[PDB]
Amino acid sequence: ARKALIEKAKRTPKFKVRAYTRCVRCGRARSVYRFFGLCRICLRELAHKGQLPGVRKASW
Amino acid sequence: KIRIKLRGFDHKTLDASAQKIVEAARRSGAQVSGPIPLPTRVRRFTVIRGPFKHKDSREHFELRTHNRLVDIINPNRKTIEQLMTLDLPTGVEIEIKT
Amino acid sequence: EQYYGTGRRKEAVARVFLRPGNGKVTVNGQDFNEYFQGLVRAVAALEPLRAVDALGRFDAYITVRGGGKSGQIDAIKLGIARALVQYNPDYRAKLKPLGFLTRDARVVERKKYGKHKARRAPQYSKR
Amino acid sequence: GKGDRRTRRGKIWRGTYGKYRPRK
Amino acid sequence: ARIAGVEIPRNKRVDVALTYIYGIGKARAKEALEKTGINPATRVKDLTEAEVVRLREYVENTWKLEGELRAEVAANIKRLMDIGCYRGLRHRRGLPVRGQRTRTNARTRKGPRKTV
Amino acid sequence: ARRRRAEVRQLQPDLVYGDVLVTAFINKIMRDGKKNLAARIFYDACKIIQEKTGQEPLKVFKQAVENVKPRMEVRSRRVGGANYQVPMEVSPRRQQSLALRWLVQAANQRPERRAAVRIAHELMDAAEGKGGAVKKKEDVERMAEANRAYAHYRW
Amino acid sequence: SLKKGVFVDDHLLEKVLELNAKGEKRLIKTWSRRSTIVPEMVGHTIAVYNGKQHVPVYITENMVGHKLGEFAPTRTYR
RNA sequence: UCGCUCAAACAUUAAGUGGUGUUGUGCGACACUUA
RNA sequence: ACCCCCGCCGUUAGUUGCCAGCGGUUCGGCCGGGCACUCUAACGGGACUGCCCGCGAAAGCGGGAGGAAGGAGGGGACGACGUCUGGUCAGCAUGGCCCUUACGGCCUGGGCGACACACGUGCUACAAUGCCCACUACAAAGCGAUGCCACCCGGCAACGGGGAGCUAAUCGCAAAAAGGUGGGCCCAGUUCGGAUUGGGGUCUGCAACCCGACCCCAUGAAGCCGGAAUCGCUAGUAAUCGCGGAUCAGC
Ligand SMILES: [Mg+2]
Ligand SMILES: [Mg+2]
Ligand SMILES: [Mg+2]
Ligand SMILES: [Mg+2]
Ligand SMILES: [Mg+2]
Ligand SMILES: [Mg+2]
Ligand SMILES: [Mg+2]
Ligand SMILES: [Mg+2]
Ligand SMILES: [Mg+2]
Ligand SMILES: [Mg+2]
Ligand SMILES: [Mg+2]
Ligand SMILES: [Mg+2]
Ligand SMILES: [Mg+2]
Ligand SMILES: [Mg+2]
Ligand SMILES: [Mg+2]
Ligand SMILES: [Mg+2]
Ligand SMILES: [Mg+2]
Ligand SMILES: [Mg+2]
Ligand SMILES: [Mg+2]
Ligand SMILES: [Mg+2]
Ligand SMILES: [Mg+2]
Ligand SMILES: [Mg+2]
Ligand SMILES: [Mg+2]
Ligand SMILES: [Mg+2]
Ligand SMILES: [Mg+2]
Ligand SMILES: [Mg+2]
Ligand SMILES: [Mg+2]
Ligand SMILES: [Mg+2]
Ligand SMILES: [Mg+2]
Numbered sequence: 001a002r003k004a005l006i007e008k009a010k011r012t013p014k015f016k017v018r019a020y021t022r023c024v025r026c027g028r029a030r031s032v033y034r035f036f037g038l039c040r041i042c043l044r045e046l047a048h049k050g051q052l053p054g055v056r057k058a059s060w
Numbered sequence: 061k062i063r064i065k066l067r068g069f070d071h072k073t074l075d076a077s078a079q080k081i082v083e084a085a086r087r088s089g090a091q092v093s094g095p096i097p098l099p100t101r102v103r104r105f106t107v108i109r110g111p112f113k114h115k116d117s118r119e120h121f122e123l124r125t126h127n128r129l130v131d132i133i134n135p136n137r138k139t140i141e142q143l144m145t146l147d148l149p150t151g152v153e154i155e156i157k158t
Numbered sequence: 159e160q161y162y163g164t165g166r167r168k169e170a171v172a173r174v175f176l177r178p179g180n181g182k183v184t185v186n187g188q189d190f191n192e193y194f195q196g197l198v199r200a201v202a203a204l205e206p207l208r209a210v211d212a213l214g215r216f217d218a219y220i221t222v223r224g225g226g227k228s229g230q231i232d233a234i235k236l237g238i239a240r241a242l243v244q245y246n247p248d249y250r251a252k253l254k255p256l257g258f259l260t261r262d263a264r265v266v267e268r269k270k271y272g273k274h275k276a277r278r279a280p281q282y283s284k285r
Numbered sequence: 286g287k288g289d290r291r292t293r294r295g296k297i298w299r300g301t302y303g304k305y306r307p308r309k
Numbered sequence: 310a311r312i313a314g315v316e317i318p319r320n321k322r323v324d325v326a327l328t329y330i331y332g333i334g335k336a337r338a339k340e341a342l343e344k345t346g347i348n349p350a351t352r353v354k355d356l357t358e359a360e361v362v363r364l365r366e367y368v369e370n371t372w373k374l375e376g377e378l379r380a381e382v383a384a385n386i387k388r389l390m391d392i393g394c395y396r397g398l399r400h401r402r403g404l405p406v407r408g409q410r411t412r413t414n415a416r417t418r419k420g421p422r423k424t425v
Numbered sequence: 426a427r428r429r430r431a432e433v434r435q436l437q438p439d440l441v442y443g444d445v446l447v448t449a450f451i452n453k454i455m456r457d458g459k460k461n462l463a464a465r466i467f468y469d470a471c472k473i474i475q476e477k478t479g480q481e482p483l484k485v486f487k488q489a490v491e492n493v494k495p496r497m498e499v500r501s502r503r504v505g506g507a508n509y510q511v512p513m514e515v516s517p518r519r520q521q522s523l524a525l526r527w528l529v530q531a532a533n534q535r536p537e538r539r540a541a542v543r544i545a546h547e548l549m550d551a552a553e554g555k556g557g558a559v560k561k562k563e564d565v566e567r568m569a570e571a572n573r574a575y576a577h578y579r580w
Numbered sequence: 581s582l583k584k585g586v587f588v589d590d591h592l593l594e595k596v597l598e599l600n601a602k603g604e605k606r607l608i609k610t611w612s613r614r615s616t617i618v619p620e621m622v623g624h625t626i627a628v629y630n631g632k633q634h635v636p637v638y639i640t641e642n643m644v645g646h647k648l649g650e651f652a653p654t655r656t657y658r
Numbered sequence: 659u660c661g662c663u664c665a666a667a668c669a670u671u672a673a674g675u676g677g678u679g680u681u682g683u684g685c686g687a688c689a690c691u692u693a
Numbered sequence: 694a695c696c697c698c699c700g701c702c703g704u705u706a707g708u709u710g711c712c713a714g715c716g717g718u719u720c721g722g723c724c725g726g727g728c729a730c731u732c733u734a735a736c737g738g739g740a741c742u743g744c745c746c747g748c749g750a751a752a753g754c755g756g757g758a759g760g761a762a763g764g765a766g767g768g769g770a771c772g773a774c775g776u777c778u779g780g781u782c783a784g785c786a787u788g789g790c791c792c793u794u795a796c797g798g799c800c801u802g803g804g805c806g807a808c809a810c811a812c813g814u815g816c817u818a819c820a821a822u823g824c825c826c827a828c829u830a831c832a833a834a835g836c837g838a839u840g841c842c843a844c845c846c847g848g849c850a851a852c853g854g855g856g857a858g859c860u861a862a863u864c865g866c867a868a869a870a871a872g873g874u875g876g877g878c879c880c881a882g883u884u885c886g887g888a889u890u891g892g893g894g895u896c897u898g899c900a901a902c903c904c905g906a907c908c909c910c911a912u913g914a915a916g917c918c919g920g921a922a923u924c925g926c927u928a929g930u931a932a933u934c935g936c937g938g939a940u941c942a943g944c
């Protein structure tokens with residue numbers, strides 16, 4: 001159940017305690033940052049590409 | 061009297077647009093306090109590299125959100141038209157209030 | 159007239175406003191022997207004054223902020239040095255060899271990832 | 286005791302306040 | 310003095326002496342002192358005869374304590390026992406009532422480690 | 426390290442008497458990085474020194490650490506596949522290190538309640554010629570002369 | 581804990597009200613082990629599910645403040 | 659408090675075998691190997 | 694090596710800060726005023742074996758001065774041709790095989806939380822360099838519109854209610870803790886230790902039996918720094934003490 005779940009994640013038919021976070025890009029079930037709305041994986045992928053504005057390689 | 065906020069990401073583009081306003085306001089009106097850099101609010105995001113299990117070698121980024129402040133005193137009519145027309149922003153979301 | 163110098167260590171800054179007089183030392187209000195209580199490093203910060211042979215002859219006034227309690231003391235130590243050396247070129251020829259003019263690069267380093275404390279790694283195992 | 290459910294640092298470690306710990 | 314019927318916390322802090330009393334601890338110890346104006350520092354070895362019956366009878370008749378308290382504790386368990394709630398069956402086999410890590414430790418109720 | 430000898434850490438001289446040996450003692454006392462706490466704890470015993478005997482804490486400290494300074498010790502070493510307990514002189518630094526160290530431990534061995542009184546009484550028996558730390562010194566020197574046979578491998 | 585208005589299902593009270601409305605049997609296969617037992621519901625038999633089947637667990641005075649799940653095993657050998 | 663035999667559990671091994679090492683039962687005062 | 698942080702200082706800007714210099718003092722940088730100085734970030738210089746002594750053919754090493762800092766100054770980013778037929782078809786994409794009124798779809802309840810046992814990684818202790826408690830002081834970084842909560846009242850309290858400010862260097866989370874002065878404690882399974890269990894409450898959520906966190910009263914367990922074995926770490930490191938976020942209804 002991968003496809004039927006990504007659709008159900010956007011449904012929110014019953015109570016709000018089912019509208020769990022869900023990555024947008026690859027539709028991951030966990031590790032979904034709320035700010036980006038993406039999973040940790042696709043997040044890094046884009047960041048290397050430069051498609052993430054203001055997101056620079058951290059070094060300190 | 062008037063106060064302008066110049067939020068944005070790239071400080072190179074923030075410096076060009078902030079310096080532009082300082083020349084346009086002073087060279088055509090009353091006094092204007094130069095660019096006042098504020099504490100850059102940064103979003104440091106840490107995370108793991110590999111897709112599966114690798115609680116190490118992880119990689120992390122940071123969202124540089126800059127801040128620059130510029131105050132113009134006397135409401136010059138030349139400065140209002142100058143900034144309304146001669147402007148070249150881009151990724152710099154500015155917000156101005158009295 | 160006055161002797162000024164900048165103090166700093168572990169992000170604990172300390173302005174040093176010194177004025178020749180008695181020995182009354184105020185730092186961010188309060189007295190020196192008052193603010194620092196039960197700390198031997200206190201009398202150590204006044205080391206620059208004992209090196210110049212003028213302990214009780216100067217009213218100090220320092221603005222030390224940020225950092226820890228002791229980091230301030232080290233900020234005062236270097237601050238007083240820059241203060242008395244400001245109006246004294248010859249007192250640098252005997253304050254420097256005694257080691258005083260240094261920001262003390264010694265500072266806490268970043269806690270590395272994968273580790274626990276920038277160096278200490280979790281207990282290795284194989285069982 | 287950083288584990289006492291009724292002490293000064295007892296709540297300081299648990300990130301709470303309560304009675305024994307001063308609260309507004 | 311024989312305070313709680315049989316218990317005799319002599320020769321020590323008056324407040325701590327009450328802690329030894331079953332059903333009485335650190336909190337109920339200070340409470341008896343602020344309701345009878347007793348100094349926690351003074352010992353039981355040197356107190357007034359009036360303060361004896363005073364503090365003693367007070368806490369004694371006030372709240373539940375001693376074996377009769379313990380009887381109620383087991384009484385409730387007889388109730389969790391007569392039917393068999395999930396809480397009771399943990400007392401049956403000796404398991405914890407929190408459903409904690411039984412796959413690992415929890416030796417406090419399970420007794421010593423029966424390697425076997 | 427295999428390359429350099431790695432130079433000693435030149436510590437800060439005493440901030441009350443003017444002597445590196447005293448500060449070094451504070452460090453051994455220093456639990457969880459509380460120098461100012463241990464410093465006082467040390468000066469506390471210094472005053473207990475003048476209380477008992479009209480003697481300066483300075484020389485009472487020197488005499489103590491001196492009489493607990495191990496002259497020789499046995500070190501293990503391999504030879505073809507066997508361990509010999511070879512005795513030989515210690516380095517000046519190591520003697521000072523062990524001396525200061527044992528003393529601290531000998532204080533912990535004492536039944537004395539307060540730490541300062543433990544270091545106080547211990548500093549007396551040490552400067553004297555008989556104490557918990559001193560007896561641990563006499564003990565190590567015995568091992569040296571005992572195995573004096575294997576002293577042929579001075580290396 | 582639900583101190584403001586004791587939690588429980590409507591169909592529970594509804595099905596059990598008609599049981600008191602004329603004093604019927606007690607058979608009632610439920611699926612809400614999350615609910616609190618009703619006081620006057622003594623003498624009935626709620627067939628509480630538990631993943632496996634319906635447990636004919638009776639009821640009485642003492643068993644009231646607790647849940648329906650309290651008196652229904654969810655694991656084998658317990 | 660020590661000496662000893664035996665049967666588990668754990669530790670050394672990359673792993674096994676064996677052994678070695680501690681605690682448990684009853685009494686007397688490293689080496690070898692790995693289709 | 695060029696990239697960033699902390700290292701010396703200045704250049705640019707002044708709602709961060711200054712009884713410092715003066716007037717009111719409610720004796721609080723609260724008002725006036727100012728930016729030199731602290732700070733907030735941005736640009737640039739600086740250290741290069743450059744100087745002297747000694748060894749040396751060269752490269753280079755050792756010692757001394759000036760300097761904030763010497764021989765990469767400390768840390769990070771950065772981890773080659775490849776190996777481990779390493780890992781991942783449950784992040785995703787994907788060749789082929791297999792299911793297709795069910796290996797697909799929906800809900801409710803249960804289950805990853807089971808316990809006679811074993812191992813790894815951790816928190817907190819087995820206490821008088823200390824435990825319980827009253828007062829006082831010094832951080833960095835971060836986050837905050839369906840969220841952070843200053844002030845007033847109820848109670849033992851969690852918590853609730855009234856209600857001001859905030860697109861956030863100037864409003865909130867916030868007392869940093871340890872530490873400084875003072876008190877009881879007196880070597881005791883202890884004012885150490887809070888695990889376990891009884892009863893009564895609060896918070897979020899359709900729903901805290903299974904299976905949440907958090908108060909309060911009580912019960913006050915194992916537990917005297919630990920065998921064979923074994924781990925971390927070379928300096929602002931170890932050890933030790935508090936703080937923040939992500940994740941997130943709450944945990
Ligand atoms: Mg996609
Ligand atoms: Mg020096
Ligand atoms: Mg550190
Ligand atoms: Mg730092
Ligand atoms: Mg850092
Ligand atoms: Mg501790
Ligand atoms: Mg918090
Ligand atoms: Mg209140
Ligand atoms: Mg009942
Ligand atoms: Mg044996
Ligand atoms: Mg047997
Ligand atoms: Mg036999
Ligand atoms: Mg014998
Ligand atoms: Mg053999
Ligand atoms: Mg064979
Ligand atoms: Mg300027
Ligand atoms: Mg300036
Ligand atoms: Mg050259
Ligand atoms: Mg040249
Ligand atoms: Mg020459
Ligand atoms: Mg050359
Ligand atoms: Mg040359
Ligand atoms: Mg030098
Ligand atoms: Mg020079
Ligand atoms: Mg070099
Ligand atoms: Mg590289
Ligand atoms: Mg496939
Ligand atoms: Mg396809
Ligand atoms: Mg079929």
Ligand SMILES: [Mg+2]
Pocket residue numbers: none
């Ligand atoms: Mg503060």
Ligand SMILES: [Mg+2]
Pocket residue numbers: 834
């Ligand atoms: Mg920062």
Ligand SMILES: [Mg+2]
Pocket residue numbers: none
């Ligand atoms: Mg948060």
Ligand SMILES: [Mg+2]
Pocket residue numbers: none
């Ligand atoms: Mg509030």
Ligand SMILES: [Mg+2]
Pocket residue numbers: 861
């Ligand atoms: Mg605002």
Ligand SMILES: [Mg+2]
Pocket residue numbers: 867
């Ligand atoms: Mg605050």
Ligand SMILES: [Mg+2]
Pocket residue numbers: none
């Ligand atoms: Mg103290």
Ligand SMILES: [Mg+2]
Pocket residue numbers: 884
């Ligand atoms: Mg106790």
Ligand SMILES: [Mg+2]
Pocket residue numbers: none
């Ligand atoms: Mg307790």
Ligand SMILES: [Mg+2]
Pocket residue numbers: 901
């Ligand atoms: Mg519950």
Ligand SMILES: [Mg+2]
Pocket residue numbers: none
């Ligand atoms: Mg030890």
Ligand SMILES: [Mg+2]
Pocket residue numbers: 680920
């Ligand atoms: Mg043994």
Ligand SMILES: [Mg+2]
Pocket residue numbers: 941
């Ligand atoms: Mg939240």
Ligand SMILES: [Zn+2]
Pocket residue numbers: 023024025026027028038039040041042043
């Ligand atoms: Zn994703």
